[PDB]
Design a protein around this motif. Structure first.
Motif: not given
Length: 524
Positions: A408-421, A463-478
């Motif tokens: 499958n592909l939940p909402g993008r070019n992913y597949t849930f297991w591939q994003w988790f791995d 530091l969260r995991f980015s939901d745009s790229e598979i193996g990446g991380i996104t940050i926060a700010w103020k």
């Protein structure tokens, strides 16, 4: 353990009764020899004919017959007791084999299955299987006991056949001698186990290792002429057909097959495979078809009479031609290792699995791959469930997930297991201690991280995991939160996440200064 104590006491009890039977058999041998040497005197007196003279002729003949009838009573009066001794001995043998069947079923069908299940689960980072040096002693003692019993039965049969008092002994000896063969065959075919598995998903033209053992081989003189074991590979279909006794002398080609060495101290007979390789495979989704490595050998026990052809199947494997197909195929493997039924046909798996067991296996392999004790908390599992809806784990407590919906592909070019791995890989290579130090959110989503930095002071991190790229991380700010473009694995391989953070942002994950979290990870 109580079960260990029970089976060890049973082992010593069997040894005691076997020594009892050996003593009785030696007594029977000596008694039969005494009976034969006493019987010789019957023929000695049956010829003491002479034809001297009528008076002494008649008197001595009458006296000789009067002695002969007493001898014919005394003999056969002792012989009936000898036959009774032999029948009681055979009954003891039969009871011993009944206890032996019970104990052998307990050992094989219960404990070895537990070890093999522990092996399957350690395949995905579960608890290690455990050393074979506990089942080794049990199997060696089983082999010693059954071999001593077979020897006693054989010598008793031969000694009773040379003085064949018919009785019922012939039937009981065609019997329980019939049962020792089944026992020893089951043992020799069921103690050929794989010690160190060949690796699951494996790429062609890459070296891999696997070690097999013969548990009872230490005492059964097979190490005298050590048999060599050969390794082949067969697809799921051929593996299924093989257990159905469908003779087919497939799959692919290996490069090595080797003899079994012996450790003189631990008394273990084992075949190591250190330089194996897969050079050509005959395939019939490439990352989904499962193969298995069959190890087979043939040897003899005792004399040239007892021969055994033994075979064992290694856990399912998936072949991967190009390296880039790795991450996906592991899923398949895990799934098998996660949900293998006890008496299932080779690689038969239930299409739809419950969610709790799924997240259990996910947490297991996660704590495995990250090599840490953090794991999946309840909120992280709730986020993972919301990814695959309401925000209570009790809602997902009774849902079912199909394999199609998993990978499958939940909402993008992913597949849930591939994003988790992918997140597994990205924090396994560059972010092991940062995950173990409690610095990566892990269960943060869009607008879920924003509400976590509004009531907090300025400059904080997340530091969260980015939901745009598979193996990446996104940050926060103020006022508003400031994300960024995903930090790809390459962006860590050139400058890790620890030094990329090194100025404007000073705090992480409320109050914890940036240095106190990352001061031990900058480049000196």
């Amino acid at each position: 353990s109580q079960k260990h104590l029970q089976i060890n006491q049973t082992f010593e009890e069997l040894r005691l009764v076997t020594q009892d039977t050996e003593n009785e058999l030696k007594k029977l041998q000596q008694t039969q020899e005494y009976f034969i040497i006493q019987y010789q005197e019957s023929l000695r007196i049956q010829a003491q004919l002479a034809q001297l003279s009528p008076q002494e002729r008649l008197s001595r003949e009458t006296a000789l017959q009067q002695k002969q009838v007493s001898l014919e009573a005394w003999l056969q009066r002792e012989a009936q007791t000898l036959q009774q001794y032999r029948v009681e001995l055979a009954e003891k043998h039969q009871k011993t084999l009944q206890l032996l069947r019970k104990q052998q079923t307990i050992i094989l069908d219960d404990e070895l299955i537990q070890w093999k299940r522990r092996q399957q689960l350690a395949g995905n980072g579960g608890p290690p299987e455990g050393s074979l040096d506990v089942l080794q002693s049990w199997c060696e003692k089983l082999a010693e006991i059954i071999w001593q019993n077979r020897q006693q039965i054989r010598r008793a049969e031969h000694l009773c056949q040379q003085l064949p008092i018919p009785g019922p002994v012939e039937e009981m000896l065609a019997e329980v001698n019939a049962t020792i063969t089944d026992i020893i065959s089951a043992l020799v075919t069921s103690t050929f186990i794989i010690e160190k598995q060949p690796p699951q998903v494996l790429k062609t033209q890459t070296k891999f290792a696997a070690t097999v053992r013969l548990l009872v081989g230490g005492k059964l003189n097979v190490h005298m002429n050590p048999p060599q074991v050969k390794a082949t590979i067969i697809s799921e279909q051929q593996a299924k057909s093989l257990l159905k006794n469908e003779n087919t002398r497939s799959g692919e080609i290996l490069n090595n097959c080797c003899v079994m060495e012996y450790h003189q101290a631990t008394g273990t007979l084992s075949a190591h495979f250190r330089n194996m390789s897969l050079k050509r495979i005959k395939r019939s989704s490439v990352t989904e078809e499962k193969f298995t490595i069959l190890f087979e050998s043939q040897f003899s026990v005792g004399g040239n009479e007892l021969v055994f052809q033994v075979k064992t199947l290694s856990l399912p494997v998936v072949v991967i031609v190009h390296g880039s197909q790795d991450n996906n195929a592991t899923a398949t493997v895990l799934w098998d290792n996660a949900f293998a039924e006890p008496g299932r046909v080779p690689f038969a798996v239930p299409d739809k699995v419950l969610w709790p067991q799924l997240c259990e296996a996910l947490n297991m392999k996660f704590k495995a791959e990250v090599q840490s004790n953090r794991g999946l908390t309840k909120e992280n599992l709730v986020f993972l469930a919301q990814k695959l809806s309401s925000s209570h784990l009790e809602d997902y407590s009774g849902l079912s997930v199909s394999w199609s919906q998993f990978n499958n592909l939940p909402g993008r070019n992913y597949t849930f297991w591939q994003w988790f791995d992918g997140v597994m890989e990205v924090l396994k290579k560059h972010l092991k201690p940062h995950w173990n130090d409690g610095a990566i959110l892990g269960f943060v989503n869009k607008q879920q991280a924003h509400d976590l930095l509004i009531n907090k002071p300025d400059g904080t991190f997340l530091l969260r995991f980015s939901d745009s790229e598979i193996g990446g991380i996104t940050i926060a700010w103020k006022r508003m939160f400031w994300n960024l473009m995903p930090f790809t694995t390459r962006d860590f391989s050139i400058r890790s996440l620890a030094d990329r953070l090194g100025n404007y942002l000073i705090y992480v994950f409320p109050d914890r200064p940036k240095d106190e979290v990352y001061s031990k990870y900058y480049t000196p």
